[PDB]
Amino acid sequence: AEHPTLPIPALLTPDAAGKIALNVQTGSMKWKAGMQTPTWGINGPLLGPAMRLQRGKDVAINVTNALPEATTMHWHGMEIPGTSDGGPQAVIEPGKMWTAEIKVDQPATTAWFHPHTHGLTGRQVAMGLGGLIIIDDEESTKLPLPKEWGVDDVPVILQDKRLDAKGHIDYQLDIITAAVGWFGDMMLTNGTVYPQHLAPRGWLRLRFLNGCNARSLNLATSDGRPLYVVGSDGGLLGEPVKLTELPILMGERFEVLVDTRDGKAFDIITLPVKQMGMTLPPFDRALPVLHIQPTLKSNEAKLPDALVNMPAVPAADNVKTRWLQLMMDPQLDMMGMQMMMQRYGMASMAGMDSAGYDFMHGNKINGIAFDMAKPMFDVKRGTYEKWTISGEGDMMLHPFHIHGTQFRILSENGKPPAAHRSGWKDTVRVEGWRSEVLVKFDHEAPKERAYMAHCHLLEHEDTGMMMSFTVS
Ligand SMILES: [Cu+2]
Ligand SMILES: [Cu+2]
Numbered sequence: 290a291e292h293p294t295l296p297i298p299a300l301l302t303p304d305a306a307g308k309i310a311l312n313v314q315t316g317s318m319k320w321k322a323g324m325q326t327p328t329w330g331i332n333g334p335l336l337g338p339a340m341r342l343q344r345g346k347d348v349a350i351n352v353t354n355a356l357p358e359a360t361t362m363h364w365h366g367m368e369i370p371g372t373s374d375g376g377p378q379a380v381i382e383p384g385k386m387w388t389a390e391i392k393v394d395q396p397a398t399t400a401w402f403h404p405h406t407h408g409l410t411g412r413q414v415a416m417g418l419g420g421l422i423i424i425d426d427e428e429s430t431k432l433p434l435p436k437e438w439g440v441d442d443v444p445v446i447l448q449d450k451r452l453d454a455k456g457h458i459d460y461q462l463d464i465i466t467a468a469v470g471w472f473g474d475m476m477l478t479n480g481t482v483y484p485q486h487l488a489p490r491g492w493l494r495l496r497f498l499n500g501c502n503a504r505s506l507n508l509a510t511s512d513g514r515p516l517y518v519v520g521s522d523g524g525l526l527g528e529p530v531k532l533t534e535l536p537i538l539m540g541e542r543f544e545v546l547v548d549t550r551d552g553k554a555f556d557i558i559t560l561p562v563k564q565m566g567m568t569l570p571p572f573d574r575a576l577p578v579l580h581i582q583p584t585l586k587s588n589e590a591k592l593p594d595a596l597v598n599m600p601a602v603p604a605a606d607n608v609k610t611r612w613l614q615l616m617m618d619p620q621l622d623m624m625g626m627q628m629m630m631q632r633y634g635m636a637s638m639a640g641m642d643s644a645g646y647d648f649m650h651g652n653k654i655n656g657i658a659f660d661m662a663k664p665m666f667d668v669k670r671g672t673y674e675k676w677t678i679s680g681e682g683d684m685m686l687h688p689f690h691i692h693g694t695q696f697r698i699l700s701e702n703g704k705p706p707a708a709h710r711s712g713w714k715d716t717v718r719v720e721g722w723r724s725e726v727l728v729k730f731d732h733e734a735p736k737e738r739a740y741m742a743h744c745h746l747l748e749h750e751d752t753g754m755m756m757s758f759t760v761s
Contacts, residue, residue, distance in 0.1 A: 292580050295484035297439035298421060301338040303348045309340055311362075313381070313418065314355035318480060324456025328417040329356060335480040337402070337420025339444060342393050344426040353386040359406070360413055364422065365540060366400035366523055366715050367391065368694055371734025371760065376692075377407040377661055378738055394731070395695060396524035396597070396713065397429035398422075399444070399496040399542045407661070408462075408649065411471055411502050411747035415450065415460045417480070419500055428597050429525060434546070435494035435590040443486060443493070445557070447537075447578060448500040449473040462751060465632065467648050468617070468625025469566040469685070470503020470748045476559075476571060478578045485580040491588040493547045493581065495557070496520075499537045502747040504572075505564050505686055508535040510547070511556035511577060517592055520544025523695030523713030527599030529592055530709040534560060538688035540745040541716050543709065546592050549583045556580055564686050566629055568639040599712060602697045605673040605727055611666065613678045615687055615719060615744060615754055618651040620644055622683075641684060650753045652744075658753025664739045667759045668730050675699070679723040687719040688745040693732055693760070700725040716745055734760040 303309050316334025317325045331337030342348055352362050352375075359382050362375050373389050381387040400422035404413040421444055435441030451473030453459040460471060478484050499506050510516065518530040522542050529546065537543055556577035561568055629637045645651070650658035655665065668674060678689045680702075695713040698706040702722045705711075717724045734740040736759055743755030 292483055292485035293481050295443070295486040295579065296479045296481060298337065298339040298444060299332070300438055301340045303342070303346070307348055309348055309350045311350060311352045312355055313352060313360055320475060320482065321452055321456050326452060326456050326458060328458070329413070330417050331420050335417040336446060337418070339421040339423050341423045341425065344393050344395070344397065344424060347390070347392045350389045350391065351386055352381055352389065354381045354383050356383055359383060360418070361405045362389070362402055363405035364389070364391065364400065364402050365690070366398060366695070367422070368395040368731060370732040371693060371738040371740050374692060374738070374740070376405040376741055393424060395424065397426040398424045398524045399498070399520065399544055400424060401498055401542065408751045411462060411751050412460050414500070414747060415458055415471060415502055419446065421498070432593055432596065433589070433591045434519065435492055435588060441489055441493055441588050441590060442496070443488070444479070444496045444498070445579060446479050446498045446500045447506055448477045449504045450475050450477055462748060464621065464625045464648060465629045466748045467651055467752045468622045469629055470746045472504055472566045474569065474571065476576060476578055483577060483580065485582060487582050487584050488549055489586040489588045490549050490552050490583050492590040492592060493549050495545050495547065497537060497543045497545065499539050499541050501539050503539065504567050505539065505562050506537045507560040507562050508537060509533060509558050509560055511558055514548060514555060517546040518543055518709040519546050519596055521709060521712040522715045525596040526709060526712045527597065528595050532709070536562070538716055538718060538745065540688060540690050547581070549581065552583045554580065554582045563639050565626070565639055565641060566637050568636055569633055573636070602699065602727060603673065605675055608673045608675050611674060611676045613676060613742065613756065614655050615678065615680050615683065616653045616656065617683045617685060618644060621646065621648055621651040648752065652749045652752045652754040654754055654756045657756070659755040661757060664736060664757040664759050667761055670733055670760050671729065671731055673727060673729050675725060676728055677723055677725045678717065678719050680719040680721055681723065684721050685749070686746060687749065688716045689719050689724070689742065690716045690745045691728060691742040692740040693734060694728050694730050696726045696728045698724065698726050730760040732760065
């Protein structure tokens with residue numbers, strides 16, 4: 290067999306009482322011969338279950354902390370009130386249980402969940418915490434898309450990790466990772482190195498998630514067969530997008546369709562990206578992350594000409610704007626790259642080049658390294674706003690994530706959004722230039738449980754590149 294079977298997260302629907310029980314517990318995985326790596330998982334030794342929720346239905350998620358240290362649980366992509374998201378203002382202490390009441394009110398999507406612990410988000414995600422949120426609505430159900438979970442509707446969580454000599458997860462929040470992020474030399478696909486999936490002939494639906502702390506990926510097929518993007522971060526697109534290459538940022542989700550009709554086996558590969566620290570082996574060349582082997586069986590699934598009603602971007606005439614300036618300390622930034630170059634070689638650079646030595650507060654937004662006690666502003670609920678997030682005077686990649694909403698990108702790093710990226714998204718690329726998004730917060734977030742907006746390169750977020758804001 291050699292290629293191990295791609296693990297499928299257990300589907301988890303709400304019980305009769307309308308509740309979902311999540312147990313954040315310790316475990317272990319086997320990735321290197323000899324030693325077993327100590328890991329953390331939700332309802333298991335690594336990653337988590339796929340919570341399937343129906344639009345309109347209420348649910349109370351009961352997160353119990355079976356870990357030696359405190360953790361939190363962000364429902365990434367959920368249009369919910371701040372009083373239900375749980376971040377640094379809703380800490381789940383060891384041995385205790387935290388409840389999150391959610392009333393699903395958003396299109397059918399592949400959303401996800403992960404810890405959002407103050408200054409430890411990168412560490413806890415690297416440790417193996419994470420999981421999926423499958424939202425179903427009426428409009429999507431009518432479509433002839435693959436629906437058989439784990440057979441033709443398959444989740445693909447792509448994460449990179451690095452192990453030490455003692456077979457432990459080598460996580461660091463040091464001078465290097467504060468600048469370029471935590472990258473590894475091992476490529477996990479649902480926690481498995483190069484898995485294999487047996488799919489029926491016809492159409493294969495892959496719910497992709499870039500669960501890397503800092504690594505951006507560029508998905509493609511081994512034989513050059515196109516990938517049909519049908520869904521983005523917060524819902525299906527208006528119509529599918531035919532692509533040969535699909536770049537995916539940290540915390541992004543792309544639902545794609547692949548033609549398995551010919552029955553030929555092929556690989557889902559990741560192409561080397563132009564990002565600092567990410568060009569080292571095994572990522573220096575095209576890397577197969579998932580082997581697809583078509584079975585003799587078939588499905589009646591088809592690629593629809595039109596998916597769902599995609600509203601037009603409203604012309605927000607005199608809406609409030611917000612300038613969010615991401616900032617990095619050059620003195621620390623330079624030391625990080627010098628240390629990266631020394632430890633990993635010149636290849637690390639990927640062909641590239643008000644202060645303090647406060648590495649834990651080196652990265653900021655609008656001059657401030659995340660102050661939980663001071664939200665930047667208050668937004669009126671149900672109003673449109675035009676937010677510009679800038680990354681000038683800094684060459685790093687910043688996938689900007691915004692809590693409690695799904696937005697439409699107006700400008701992505703200068704140029705307009707790509708075909709697939711013009712739908713509903715909660716993450717926007719900010720790399721060396723400025724981006725503009727059209728946001729609207731339909732749910733409140735008080736000072737006590739405020740929303741956040743941060744860079745999804747977890748190490749930048751843990752070193753201060755995060756801001757909070759209220760909605761009322
Ligand atoms: Cu997230
Ligand atoms: Cu960043």
